[PDB]
Design a protein around this ligand. Structure first.
Ligand SMILES: *[B]([O])([O])[C]([C][C]([C])[C])[N]C(=O)[C]([C]C1=[C][C]=[C][C]=[C]1)[N]C(=O)C1=[C]N=[C][C]=N1
Ligand SMILES: [Mg+2]
Ligand SMILES: [Mg+2]
Ligand SMILES: [Mg+2]
Ligand SMILES: [Mg+2]
Lengths: 233, 235, 204, 212, 231, 195, 222, 244, 240
């Protein structure tokens, strides 16, 4: 049993017709202090998987090392390491899910919420969640922390059920994600303007976008708001 | 000296092959399987007339549906029987059912090769494990100290084994009754035994679906011995 | 609840001219209930005397432990243990149970057989040695005993005078403590003779 | 839960209720609270359902191993002591069990042992265990004799459970009756309280308080 | 001679005699054949009996839905090693949701057998194994030796008189490899291959044992009247 | 359990122990014998937490019986009491201590003297002319302080014991369902069936 | 302080027919007042004509099902591909649950299938391994809503025959697969209305001698 | 591996003897003779030091007679270093018993414990046995004065008079001749010294070549006193008995 | 730990360490067991090479395992103590858990199991001891007499002997003991036991020990004078 110290906030994601999109801001908070402004919380594994992590950053770095070591171990005595016997999103997720549940069962959890996004060998979209309790679930849209409360509602208007996935393009899906990140910057007190976004497409592969910013914000109406009720000036 | 788990140039484990020689010195035990049941019989072989022969326990119950006969260094069999009984009862606890005869035999045979430098040597005793289950019916198995087990329609082990096995070769057929099998065990035991066969120096047992595993009384066996003498004198 | 004051009891020791004295009460109780009036708290291994206050089960256990150790000492060393050496043995033995201690207040008393020098010492429950010139106190009426000893005591008292001082120190201290009393014993110790006196005191 | 067992002229009567609850929620009305250890040993169960089932099922395995090894059925004393020694190892861990080990042997005769997860093991003639035990004791003690017929003793046990099923909120469902004799136990049916209550009320003239 | 007392002793020519004596136990064992095409992989095993009253010793063991082996030598050692494979296949499934690669399964067996050849007290395994399987890179056939050496092959045979079946497969290499989408013809080639190792005795109904795994075919064993078709 | 008493007279030791066994709001039994014979001339009564009491008593019994067979000799009551004390003194610093208080009444055949030892769960041993555990002593010690004489006969001891039980039955809140009385003397151990 | 348990909501329902059995469960997965997934399968085919669901804390639920599926696999290996009977599976599950008696799987488990006489069978478990064969059982969050309805409509409790007035009970006629599915659908629709953790979708697994069939139905998504 | 160098100390010969035990007894047969004699009013322990030197400090020396507790003593025959290992174990065992039962350990119980330790080294562990034979002289209130002996086999027996070490055959014959049941300590002292004086391999028996001890009830009232004799005291008793 | 396999098979299928343990039993002093109709008697030889012994304190050959069972032996004396101790512990353990004293068969089965365990455990040699275990089961009047040996095999005997010159005394018992009518009284049984030892012992003075065990924990050891009376009567009848 511990308490989380340096923490990362929401990770958000969704499926679209040819793949999956995932995003997370670049902040490492220290309680109310916005301590570290250059933290990458999306960690790619190969050219077909991206693991998005929220919660304790020290534990995130541990998980980052476990995945890095997983790639090394998979390459050992494996001529098809960059082909048929390459690491799949489903393999990477199940490994993490095993670790997360084992650690919670020893009363010494990895204080994180994780989303594994990727594309399988047969072109199928992979998107699944796992957290400190070892709880797992899949859905057309997935989000952690504040994202669950604010991002999912917006992303579910685009893809409400399974049959909406083939009807959703990469442009529409990316637009929804970027909008959701703006809403989180408006309303999450432990978020930052700077974020990273990753797209894993079955045709165009892995596109990793760094140093993105929330833009087109509405603040002008603030000038008209005066006092808290009766005040006019 | 030399290792306990050493291979010979022929590709056999010395200690396992030597334990098989100890089994050849043991008293005779015969098993016969039929569609009406499986019969198990043994030679008691008392070393002296003062020895109370009823205390010689070379036929043993493992569960209600599984019996066992032994031959060789019979002291070694006690831990094997204890393991078999525990395995049978434990499986009933975990699965609310009787355990398959083959599965029980396999569990006993897993102990066999757990020796090295675990126990210090292989077992010096062979077992005839007879029983019944719903899947494969009436069965008879021969469990060696090599860890190997063969299923048999009929089998003899001990000092008069090769002579008895040749006799079982001719006599056994797939339509044998239980009564015919009982007499056949007594017939072959009487042939290979040094001393004259009677109810005190030989023991019978069987396993049926209805009544389960039963060791025969000396009064019941005596009648079957008397029934045997008459039918041999008949022709 | 507090282990050091379930059973109750006291021990006091004093030095005199070429002599030492050690005394104790006889009570053993279960909180308010008085159980035994014959529970002596002073033991001896050869010429070295040990008084022990506190939890009664540990008083008994430690006596048996030091009898054990002083007997082995004597067999190997081929001589009786001295008070200075025994004091160290008590300290060592108590400290090895640092985080699971015997709930006791030991007191050593005796005369060194070679030098003839009078010796007393006190300990806390985990082994700290208090080697006083004048006197040592222990038990549930330690405050009372400190007050009596600090006022009544003077140095270089003769054995028969020292008896009166230590006896009056114990008796009057015990009478101001609910968990002490029910009889008392006083040992007067000289280089080659030891007198043991049971005191008449109020039985409440 | 209400379970009872008492010694008498014709052996032992065992009677139990059938209810299981989680707080105020009635989880089951069809629970088997008598466990058939062997053809001559019965075990009642009260308290934690899983603890009781697991360990009395386990007890049967230990009793079966005994008679394989010793070529002789286990005594009621030895069977009860296996269970009591087991739960004593787990003392403090939070097992919740109250049982009667009931059976007959040649050397002992009809015997009842009360065994409990605190480690208590008591031989006795009459026992009632469970949340509704006091209600059962009221009927049982006022009507008990050594010289009872099998028919009358069975009814008394049935009636004592009914009394507790009525008053105790955590007892009810149905009554399972057993009769243990020299030749083993005999099952005497499941008796639904919903039908048994009105039957007893009318015939016996009891429960005049209730309207029917 | 003086250097065969235990597994921890090299001979003057750099040989490990205890390992070689363990290898000898395989040659005494009954013959078994392995072969594959691009779609399927087949095991064919000649079972041995003690006498006419006895049953025929089982030669093939299932490890997973997509993998299994045939044995030749000490059967209990095959049970230990097959149990280890079952666990390793199972660990891969539970932890990584991944069917164990046949090549990696061979690597694990190699390393397990090796530890027994370098340490004092223990002994080498006295059995040879033919592992077949279908994974993400198609059909596979492996040959395990208790020295530790594991080899991926198109076809092979081990046991007594196994040289005859091995020569046949060496001639038929170009033919049976092309038998794709046809299990019965691949088995026929396996049954015809094991027939080259027979002397005196012939393939009867309770003598023969066949197993197969493929693209849309789980690892299944055929015994009894199920193999009468191929006699 | 509740009340256990002991009294050492001229030529014997008398132990009295309640018959009630109460779990919760019900008296489950009214004929429970809270004692075990450790040896032919040594008897131990006990009271404490449920389960622990019997488990401890029988464990001690087994150990003394083992000693008796090994040496073909009966240990003195003093020796048995010291053994028992050490077990309890060991127990009190265990993971889960034995929560048991005992009285050990024995007749020493060597010294021809009766002996009574009172030992609590902490391992606190005392030899006494009369003893008690729990709330029993709060009533009985005052009576025994008045009446007891060291040269009493066994019959006088039983009368003095009746006077103790009568006081307990009058003033204690719990119904302990009477007592089983046992006498320990030179001839061994016997039970007074009428009390 | 770290709390190793959580509540993923949901509700499951098993009903035993004369020659069939069904095990139903909603597809919603939640934490607190949020929806994790509208379709997260909860009832699983475990082989040997046995279906299983472990409702409550999903992490423990998945772990248990995973371990039982594993137990079925090793039962085949160790006992010559013998079919694991429903009664044997139930006893095995008791030992899996009681094995963690002092750190329990926080789930209510139900399995369904056919007994060795071919008749429909449902077994029900508490978190620590206590079990019991039943003709009818609902488990999980909305179990308190559904079970009473099933006592009434499956076992005909508190129902009597007209004209007799409380004297003659309603006869316990058997229910067909079409009749059972109607009761399952109405049970979940009713539970969805009054329980916030129940909704989104209903997935039913039907077990017969022919095998395991699946049926899916939409539920309210609010 | 290591098997090559294992002597296998705990095995049977074809005749059914324990090799190492037999060879340990052969070692002890060359050790200095020790004699124990039990009387009605006490026990005597006498022992011969092996070929001493004039420069050996005798008064502070102890190779034969050791004290286990106030009531029990032992005479050693064999390897002194081996004996001291066992002696310290026996001293501890006596104290454990005293702590447990609050009574001095009965002589036989102490003897059995040491004998069981020796037995263990012959049946398991693969270690060599202790090359030591003891004569136990002790007293308790059950059996009174007792003499025992134990050897490397772990077998022990009780005696009225007994010898261990060198020339036991000759020594036992002489003891068997002159010993009587109604004998006293003073007479037993004389018998012990006379027996050593005849069996000794030395030219003459002197005070500097002896260790001597008695266990007497000859103590102020009902109690037992152990007397380990000093060099000058051994010299006086040699003149008194008329040997020097 | 020392794990060396001392008890192992040889080419001819023999375990020499177990067989050499029997030779140690052959060397041991003679012990005999005879059961009557309502009693069992255990006779034991004391070699008279050891005089100047203290017979009060010397370990007796017959050991009580419980109040109703006794154990005598032939072979290594030190080894016998280990078996006796284990047996005594198991006897009290059985009473504690089963609430009933051990049967003679059970106690024999335990001791025999311990002996067997030492024939296939690493780093240990077999016990060089064979035992005769005799007594009466609880609440039973049928006499019991069992034998054990280093291998671990055990069996029941109407009458049996072990140790040195046991071949001779077994010859005597085989012709003199009748199964249809065993020694009806205590006298007849003790007489037959003393007679059988007199074939081997040498002198009938302090060389014969007799222990009579009767039902309901009634065990007693005969004194020198009591045994001497049997020796006198046997030889006086023989002079004819
Ligand atoms: B009975 O009331 O003791 C009963 C017996 C049990 C074998 C079914 N116990 C229960 O009903 C307990 C609750 C309880 C009530 C009163 C006293 C003690 C305990 N219930 C359970 O054990 C249980 C198990 N699984 C599901 C629901 N309840
Ligand atoms: Mg006071
Ligand atoms: Mg137990
Ligand atoms: Mg006290
Ligand atoms: Mg909603």
């Amino acid at each position: 049993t511990q308490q989380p110290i340096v923490t990362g906030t929401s990770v958000i994601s969704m499926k679209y017709d040819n793949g999956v999109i995932i995003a997370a801001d670049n902040l490492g908070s220290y309680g109310s202090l916005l301590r570290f402004n250059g933290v990458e919380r999306l960690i790619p594994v190969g050219d077909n998987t991206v693991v998005g992590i929220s919660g304790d950053i020290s534990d995130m770095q541990h998980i980052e090392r476990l995945l890095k070591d997983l790639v090394t171990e998979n390459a050992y005595d494996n001529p098809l390491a960059d082909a048929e016997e390459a690491l799949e999103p489903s393999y990477i997720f199940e490994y993490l899910a095993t670790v997360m549940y084992q650690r919670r069962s020893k009363m010494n959890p990895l204080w994180n919420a994780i989303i594994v996004a990727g594309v399988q060998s047969n072109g199928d979209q992979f998107l699944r969640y796992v957290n400190l309790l070892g709880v797992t679930y899949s859905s057309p849209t997935l989000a952690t922390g504040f994202g669950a409360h604010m991002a999912n509602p917006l992303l579910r208007k685009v893809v409400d059920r399974e049959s909406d996935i083939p009807k959703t393009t990469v442009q529409v899906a990316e637009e929804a994600i970027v909008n959701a990140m703006r809403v989180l910057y408006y309303r999450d007190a432990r978020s930052s303007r700077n974020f990273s976004l990753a797209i894993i497409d079955k045709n165009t592969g892995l596109t990793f976008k760094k140093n993105l910013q929330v833009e087109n914000m509405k603040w002008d109406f603030a000038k008209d708001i005066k006092g808290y009720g009766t005040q006019k000036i | 000296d030399r290792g306990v788990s050493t291979f010979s140039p022929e590709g056999r484990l010395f200690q396992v092959e030597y334990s098989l020689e100890a089994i050849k010195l043991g008293s005779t035990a015969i098993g016969i399987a039929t569609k009406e049941g499986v019969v198990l019989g043994v030679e008691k072989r008392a070393t002296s007339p003062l020895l109370e022969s009823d205390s010689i326990e070379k036929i043993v119950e493992i569960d209600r549906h599984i019996g066992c006969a032994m031959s060789g260094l019979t002291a070694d069999a006690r831990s094997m029987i204890e393991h078999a009984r525990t395995a049978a009862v434990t499986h009933n606890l975990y699965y609310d059912e009787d355990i398959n005869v083959e599965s029980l035999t396999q569990s006993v045979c897993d102990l066999a090769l757990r020796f090295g430098e675990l126990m210090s040597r292989p077992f010096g005793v062979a077992l005839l494990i007879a029983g019944h289950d719903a899947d494969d019916g009436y069965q008879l198995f021969h469990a060696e100290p090599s860890g190997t087990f063969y299923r048999y329609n009929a089998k003899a082990i001990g000092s008069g084994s090769e002579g008895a096995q040749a006799e079982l070769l001719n006599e056994w057929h797939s339509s044998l009754t239980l009564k015919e099998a009982e007499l056949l065990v007594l017939k072959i035991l009487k042939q290979v035994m040094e001393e004259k066969l009677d109810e005190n120096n030989a023991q019978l047992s069987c396993i049926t679906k209805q009544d389960g595993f039963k060791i025969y009384d000396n009064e019941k066996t005596a009648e079957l011995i008397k029934e045997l003498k008459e039918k041999e004198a008949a022709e | 609840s507090d282990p050091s004051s379930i059973n109750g009891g006291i021990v006091v020791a004093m030095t005199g001219k070429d002599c030492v004295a050690i005394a104790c009460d006889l009570r053993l109780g279960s909180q308010s209930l008085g159980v035994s009036n014959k529970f002596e708290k002073i033991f001896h291994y050869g010429h070295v005397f040990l008084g022990i206050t506190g939890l009664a089960t540990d008083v008994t256990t430690l006596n048996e432990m030091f009898r054990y150790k002083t007997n082995l000492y004597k067999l190997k060393e081929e001589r009786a243990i001295e008070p200075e050496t025994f004091t160290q043995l008590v300290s060592s033995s108590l400290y090895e149970r640092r985080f699971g201690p015997y709930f006791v207040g030991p007191v050593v008393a005796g005369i060194n057989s070679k030098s003839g020098k009078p010796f007393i010492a006190g300990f806390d429950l985990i082994g700290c040695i208090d080697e006083a010139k004048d006197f040592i106190v222990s038990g549930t009426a330690s405050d009372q005993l400190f007050g009596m000893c600090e006022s009544l005591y003077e140095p270089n008292l003769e054995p028969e005078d020292l008896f009166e001082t230590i006896s009056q120190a114990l008796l009057n201290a015990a009478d101001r403590d609910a968990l002490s009393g029910w009889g008392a014993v006083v040992y007067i110790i000289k280089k080659d003779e030891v007198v043991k006196r049971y005191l008449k005191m109020r039985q409440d | 839960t209400t379970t009872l067992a008492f010694r008498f002229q014709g052996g032992i009567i065992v009677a139990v209720d059938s209810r299981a609850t989680a707080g105020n929620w009635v989880a089951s009305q069809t629970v088997k609270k008598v466990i058939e250890i062997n053809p001559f040993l019965l075990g009642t169960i009260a308290g934690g359902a899983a603890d009781c089932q697991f360990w009395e099922t386990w007890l049967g395995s230990q009793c079966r191993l005994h008679e394989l090894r010793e070529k002789e059925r286990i005594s009621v004393a030895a069977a009860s002591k296996i269970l009591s020694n087991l739960v004593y190892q787990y003392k403090g861990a939070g097992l919740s069990m109250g049982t009667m080990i009931c059976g007959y042997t040649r050397k002992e005769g009809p015997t009842i042992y009360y065994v409990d997860s605190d480690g208590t093991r008591l031989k006795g003639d009459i026992f009632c265990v469970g949340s509704g035990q006091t209600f059962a004791y009221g009927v049982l003690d006022s009507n008990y004799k050594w010289d009872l017929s099998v028919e009358d003793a069975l009814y008394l046990g049935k009636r004592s459970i009914l009394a507790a099923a009525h008053r105790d909120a955590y007892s009810g469902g149905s009554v399972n009756l057993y009769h243990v004799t020299e030749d083993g136990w005999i099952y005497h049916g499941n008796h639904d309280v919903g039908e048994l209550f009105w039957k007893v009320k009318e015939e016996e003239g009891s429960f005049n308080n209730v309207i029917g | 001679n003086n250097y065969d007392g235990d597994t921890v002793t090299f001979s003057p020519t750099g040989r490990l005699f205890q390992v070689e004596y363990a290898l000898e136990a395989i040659k005494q064992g009954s013959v078994t054949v392995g072969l594959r095409s691009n779609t399927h992989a087949v095991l064919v095993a000649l079972k041995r009996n003690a006498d006419e009253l006895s049953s025929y010793q089982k030669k093939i063991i299932k490890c997973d839905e997509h993998m299994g082996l045939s044995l030749a030598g000490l059967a209990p050692d095959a049970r230990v090693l097959s149990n280890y494979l079952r666990q390793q296949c199972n660990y891969s499934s539970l932890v990584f949701n991944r069917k164990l690669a046949v090549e990696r399964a061979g690597h694990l067996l190699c390393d397990k057998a090796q530890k027994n050849t370098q340490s004092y007290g223990g002994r080498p395994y006295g059995v040879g194994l033919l592992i077949i399987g279908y994974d993400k890179s198609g059909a596979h056939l492996l040959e395990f030796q208790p020295s530790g050496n594991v080899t991926e092959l198109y076809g092979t045979a081990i046991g007594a008189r196994s040289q005859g079946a091995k020569t046949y497969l060496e001639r038929t290499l170009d033919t049976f490899i092309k038998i794709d989408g046809n299990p019965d013809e691949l088995i026929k080639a396996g049954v015809e291959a094991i027939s080259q190792s027979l002397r005196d005795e012939s393939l009867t109904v309770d003598n023969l044992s066949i197993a197969i795994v493929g693209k849309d075919t789980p690892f299944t064993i055929y015994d009894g009247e199920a193999v009468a078709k191929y006699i | 359990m509740d009340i256990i008493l002991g009294i050492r007279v001229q030529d014997s030791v008398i132990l009295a122990s309640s018959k009630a066994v109460t779990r919760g709001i019900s008296v489950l039994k009214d004929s429970d014998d809270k004692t075990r014979q450790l040896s032919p001339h040594t008897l131990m009564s006990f009271a404490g937490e449920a389960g622990d009491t019997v488990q401890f008593a029988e464990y001690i019994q087994a150990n003394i019986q083992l000693y008796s067979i090994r040496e073909d000799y009966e240990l003195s009551p003093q020796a048995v009491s010291s053994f028992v004390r050490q077990e309890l003194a060991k127990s009190i610093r265990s993971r889960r201590p034995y929560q048991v208080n005992v009285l050990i009444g024995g007749y020493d055949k060597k010294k021809n003297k009766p002996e009574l030892y009172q030992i609590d769960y902490l391992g606190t041993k005392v030899e006494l002319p009369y003893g008690a555990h729990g709330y029993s002593g709060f009533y009985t010690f005052s009576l025994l302080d008045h009446h007891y004489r060291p040269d009493m006969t066994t019959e006088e001891g039983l009368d003095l014991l009746k006077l103790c039980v009568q006081e307990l039955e009058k003033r204690m809140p719990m119904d302990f369902k009477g007592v089983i009385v046992k006498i320990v003397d030179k001839d061994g151990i016997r039970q007074v069936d009428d009390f | 302080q770290f709390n190793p348990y959580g509540d993923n909501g949901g509700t499951i329902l098993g009903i035993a027919g004369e020659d069939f059995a069904v095990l139903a469960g909603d597809t919603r997965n939640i934490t607190d007042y949020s929806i994790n997934s509208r379709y997260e399968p909860k009832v699983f085919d475990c082989g040997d004509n046995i279906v299983m669901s472990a409702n409550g804390f999903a992490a423990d639920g998945d772990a248990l099902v995973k371990r039982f599926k594993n137990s079925v696999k090793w039962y085949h290996f160790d006992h010559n591909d013998k079919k694991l009977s429903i009664n044997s599976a139930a006893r095995n599950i008791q030992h899996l649950l009681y094995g963690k008696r002092f750190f329990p799987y926080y789930v209510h488990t139900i399995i369904a299938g056919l007994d060795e006489d071919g008749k429909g069978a449902v077994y029900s478990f508490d978190p620590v391994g206590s079990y019991e064969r039943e003709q009818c059982r609902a488990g999980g969050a909305a179990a308190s809503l559904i079970m009473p309805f099933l006592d009434n409509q499956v076992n005909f409790k508190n129902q009597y025959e007209p004209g007799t007035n409380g004297k003659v009970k309603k006869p316990l006629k058997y229910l067909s697969v079409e009749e059972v599915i109607k009761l399952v659908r109405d049970s979940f629709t009713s539970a969805t209305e009054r329980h916030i953790q129940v909704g989104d979708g209903l997935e039913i697994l039907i077990v017969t001698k022919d095998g395991v069939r699946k049926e899916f139905y939409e539920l309210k998504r609010d | 591996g290591s098997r090559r160098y294992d002597s296998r100390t705990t095995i049977f010969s074809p005749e059914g003897r324990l090799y190492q035990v037999e060879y340990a007894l052969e070692s002890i047969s060359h050790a200095g003779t020790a004699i124990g004699i039990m009387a009605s009013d006490g026990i005597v322990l006498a022992a011969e030091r092996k070929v001493t030197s004039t420069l050996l400090e005798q008064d502070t020396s102890t190779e034969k007679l050791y004290k286990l507790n106030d009531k029990i003593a032992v005479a050693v025959a064999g390897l002194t270093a081996d004996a001291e290992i066992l002696i310290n174990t026996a001293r501890i065992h006596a104290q454990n018993y005293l702590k447990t039962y609050n009574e001095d350990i009965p002589v036989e119980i102490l003897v059995r414990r040491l004998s069981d330790i020796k037995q263990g080294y012959t049946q398991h562990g693969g270690l060599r046995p202790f090359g030591v034979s003891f004569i136990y002289a002790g007293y308790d209130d059950r059996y009174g004065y007792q003499l025992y002996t134990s050897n490397p086999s772990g077998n022990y027996t009780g005696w009225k008079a007994i010898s261990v070490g060198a020339n036991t055959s000759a020594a036992q014959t002489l003891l068997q001749m002159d010993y009587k049941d109604d004998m006293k300590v003073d007479d037993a002292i004389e018998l012990a010294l006379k027996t050593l004086s005849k069996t000794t391999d030395s030219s003459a028996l002197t005070y500097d070549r002896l260790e001597f001890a008695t266990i007497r009830k000859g103590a102020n009232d009902g109690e037992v006193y152990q007397k380990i004799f000093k060099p000058q005291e051994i010299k006086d008793i040699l003149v008194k008995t008329g040997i020097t | 730990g020392y794990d060396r396999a001392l008890s192992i098979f040889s080419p001819d299928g023999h375990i020499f360490q177990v067989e050499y343990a029997l030779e140690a039993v052959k060397r041991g002093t003679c012990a005999v067991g005879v059961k009557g109709k309502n009693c069992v008697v255990l006779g034991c030889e004391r070699r008279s090479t050891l005089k100047l012994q203290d017979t009060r304190i010397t370990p007796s050959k017959v050991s009580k395992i419980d109040s109703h069972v006794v154990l005598s032996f032939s072979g290594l004396n030190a080894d016998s103590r280990i078996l006796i101790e284990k047996a005594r512990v198991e006897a009290q353990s059985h009473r504690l858990t089963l609430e009933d004293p051990v049967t003679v068969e059970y106690l024999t089965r335990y001791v025999a199991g311990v002996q067997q365990r030492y024939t296939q455990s690493g780093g240990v040699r077999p016990f060089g001891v064979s035992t005769l275990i005799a007594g009466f089961d609880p609440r039973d009047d049928e006499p019991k007499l069992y034998q054990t040996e280093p291998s671990g095999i055990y069996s029941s005997w109407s009458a049996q002997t072990i140790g040195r010159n046991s071949k001779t005394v077994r010859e005597f018992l085989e012709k003199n003991y009748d199964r249809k009518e065993p020694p009806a009284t205590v006298e007849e049984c003790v007489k037959l036991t003393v007679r059988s030892l007199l074939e081997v012992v040498q002198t009938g003075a302090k060389n014969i020990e007799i222990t009579v065990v009767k039902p309901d924990s009634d065990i007693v050891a005969l004194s020198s004078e009591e045994i001497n009376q049997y020796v006198t009567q046997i030889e006086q009848e023989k002079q004819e």
